[PDB]
Every structure is written in structure tokens, then in C-alpha cells.
Amino acid sequence: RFASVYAWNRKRISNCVADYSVLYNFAPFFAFKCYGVSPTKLNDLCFTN
Amino acid sequence: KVSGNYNYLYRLFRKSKLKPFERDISTEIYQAGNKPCNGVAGFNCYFPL
Amino acid sequence: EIVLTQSPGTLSLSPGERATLSCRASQTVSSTSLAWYQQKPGQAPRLLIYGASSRATGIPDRFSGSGSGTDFTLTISRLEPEDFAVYYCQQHDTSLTFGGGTKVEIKR
Amino acid sequence: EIVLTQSPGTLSLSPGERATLSCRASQTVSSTSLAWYQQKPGQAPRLLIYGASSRATGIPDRFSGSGSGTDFTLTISRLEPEDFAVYYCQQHDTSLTFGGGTKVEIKR
Amino acid sequence: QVQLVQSGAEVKKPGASVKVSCKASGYPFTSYGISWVRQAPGQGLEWMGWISTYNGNTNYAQKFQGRVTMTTDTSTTTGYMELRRLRSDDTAVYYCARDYTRGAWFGESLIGGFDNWGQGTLV
Questions:
Q1: What does the annotation give as the result of altering residue 1 to T (chain A)?
Q2: Domains of chain D (ranges plus CATH)?
């Protein structure tokens, strides 16, 4: 149910743990395309939402 | 140069911080992640220079 | 080697009119190679422009230069006819060869 | 809800040969609306394929998927004699509906 | 690594409520919901139950809408049914499963299937 680009849905992440191993090491479809973040240290540094 | 200067290089990725006053010149393809590149220079293997 | 090619054949202008000079090369001359000289009749050469727009021997308000890469131009405004010297250009990066030159006459 | 039209009534064939399982939809389903499961006598169902053709639980050389658009089909090559598993196919667009069931006998 | 354990066989008289439990372990009990299916011999399965773990969103089947009520506990990560409106000939097996089709937080249309199943109980 991926909405169209004219109107999408916002996904707000509550209090939980961010694990990005399933994104990088598991199913590496295409480029990581990190904007400003350490791909090895994605989880070692964390944000609010 | 109107076409730009491609004769000037700088190392971008390295294993460790440089100790003062020595060279780190080396012809090798950076190994990021868990992909043991044997000269592929593909995904997760970018030229440090 | 590369020999310079010049086609400002004659500067047939009176004092007060703008003067433009070109030093187009053969295939490429990099921007870190520029020299300009005035060859006065019966005298010795002297440097005026050694780069883009710098001064060597005074240059109060007349000798100006600009350009980038394949094109380089020299501009003179409000020319005083005492010198009427030959405009010579020189590149340095591709060996060394003086330009063809351009005599400056008075147009009485 | 939309049910899946299934007619593998009885795949009474010798093990190790080509086996075809039909899971034709009613009118129209998306290509990524598929799920294939196996069940064994005296054993709980296990998942086989969670998508179009990706392997979910092992699938060494037997289970494969083909088709395009709406119609899709399951393919078995070199079927292991012991399993004789009853296959189920489920969609994703309209709620969640299972297959009727495919019975395979000993075929001595 | 994942362990789904369940109680033993039970027989419940008609008109009562049968309590059925399934303890889940071995997987992080926050990223997946808890689904519940029924199976009888000679037929496939159904879509009778689903309750998430982060929230209590209800997505039960319309065929038995308002007939199934159940709880999920994070203290032991156990799913409990107090199934009512019991019938004599509903001695069909009930299976707990991990939902990889319904979103356990928002309710997205997750591509995939119920990759895991419990050991089963008899009612």
C-alpha cells in the first residue's frame, strides 16, 4: 500500500531500538545512499524520532 | 583549467588516523563492510583517491 | 611543440578608442602560462602582463587582461600614442614559443 | 473476499518428475500477492515461499515460482520421494484466503 | 532459536469458554504481531485471530466478528484465548503464529507469510 508521491504517509517511530543490520547486511538491493551518517556507526549514534 | 585539473589527488578513506610526517601513498581499493573485493572496485569498494 | 597563432593584423585606431588583443593558441595553453610585452621601435622588450591582470612596470590605467582556458584577451582603454609598441604574447606551459606579434601604428 | 480457483485435485505422479501447481486468481491480483506453504501428514504446515520466487525455508532445488501479472504457477523438479507435501497458495490483495489442497499418493 | 510452546490437550463442553495459551520466545517480542489460525482434517486453515504486541488493534475475520476475544502479554510474551460460544464438534486444532503480513505497529500490508508456527493444542 505504498501511497503515490502526490500524497504519502508519515511514519513516526516511538520509543524503541534502531537496528540497521537488516538494511545493510541483509538484502542489499541497491546503493546505501547515506546523506550524512556513518554506515558502520549508524546505531552507535542515535536521534529522537 | 576550463575542463578542470584531474592531476591533483587526496586520500579520502584510510584505516587509521595519520601519525604526523609520513606518507600513506598506496594503490589499493577501499574495503568497506563485508565484501572482500579482489580488485572488483564495485559496491562498498570505492577508490580512496 | 606548439606555435602561437595571432590574427590582430592591424590596430588601425586613433588614440581614445578601445584596443583589443587576442593570443589564441593551437590546441591548449593552460592558464598558468602567460606573458605580455611591449616592443617599442628601436628599444628592448619589457614585461607588462605576466598573468591574468597583474602589473609589471607601472601600468596606471591602460594595460588590462582577462580570459580563462582556451581564450585570453587584452584590453587597452584611453591609449596615449607615445608608445605605439608591438603587442607580444607568450605561453610557457607547452615548451616556449613567442607569438606572432602585432605592430601598433598611429593612423595619422 | 476473493477465493483462489484451484484444481490440483490429485498429483498422482512418480517422485522426481515435473510437478505443476495452479493458483489462478478470480479476476485480478497483484504480482507480489503470493505465498506458498507445505504440510505433511502428522506434521504442522511449514512456509515455502513468502513472495514471488524468493526462498523462505531452504528450498534446495525443488520449489520454484513462475507467472506474470495475474496468473502464477508453482513448479517442482526432482521431487524428494518422502515429502509428498500438500501445497497451499495464499494471496495478499483481498484479506487472506488459503488453497483447497493438493493430495499426492504413494505412486508405487 | 525461536521457541513456541503450548499447553496440552483439553476437552470443553458446549456453552463454556476454552482457554488456550501459546508462549513465545527466542525472537524480539516487539517487531511482530501474534496471529491465530484454526485447522481441521480435510480442509485448510482460516483467518480467525490477530492481535499486535505494541498496541491492541483488532483485525479479526468478519465471519466470526465479535466472536473471538483474546489477549497478548509481554510479561511472558504469551497469547491467551477465552474462546466463547463453544460447540461440541469444534475439536479442531488452534495454532499460534508470527504475523509477517500485518504491521504490528501501524498495520501495513507486509509482503510475506506466517514463517513460524506453534506446537499446537487440542480443544
A1: In strain: Omicron/BQ.1.1, Omicron/XBB.1.5, Omicron/EG.5.1
A2: 4-106 (2.60.40.10)
Burial of E45 (0-12, 13-18, 19+ CB in 10 A): buried
Q: How many CB atoms lie within 10 A of CB C38?
A: 19
Which residues of chain A lie closer than 8 angstroms to B33, CB-CB?
Answer: 24-25, 39-40
Inter-chain CB proximity B1 and C30 less than 8 Å: yes
Dihedral over alpha carbons E21, E27, E30, E31 (to 10 degrees): -120
The values of phi and psi at residue B26, to 5°, are -165, 130
Which experimental approach was used here? cryo-EM
Burial E82-111 (b: 16+ CB within 10 A, else e): ebeeeeeeeeebbbbbbbbbbbbbeeeebb
Which of E123, E120, E102 lies closest to E52 in space, CA to CA? E102
Contact E94, E38 (CB under 8 A): yes
- The residues that bridge with C49 in the sheet, in sequence order, are C36
Q: Choose among D44, D46, D100: nearest Cβ to E120.
A: D44
Q: Which amino acid is at C43?
A: Q
3-state DSSP assignment of residue A22: helix
**Which domains are assigned to chain E?**
3-122 (2.60.40.10)
CB contact under 8 A, B33 and A31: no
Interface test with D, best of E36, E43, E46, E47 (most D CBs within 10 A): E47
Grid cell listed for A37: 551518517
Q: How far apart are CA A3 and CA D3, in angstroms?
A: 26
Rounded to an integer, what distance in angstroms lies between the CA atom of residue C74 and that of residue C36?
Answer: 9
CA distance C33 to C54: 13
Restricting to B residues 28-47, those with a Cβ less than 8 Å away from any Cβ of A are 32-34, 43
Of A1, A11, A16, the CB nearest to E30: A16
Q: What is the arrangement of strands in the sheet containing E49-51, beginning at the earlier edge strand?
A: E49-51, E33-39, E93-99
Question: What's the Cα-to-Cα distance from D97 to each of D2, D70, D93, E81, rounded to whole Å?
Answer: 7, 16, 10, 23
**CA–CA separation, A42 vs A23, rounded Å?**
11
* Strand E33-39 to E49-51 pairing: antiparallel
Q: Which residue has the cell 507445505?
A: D38
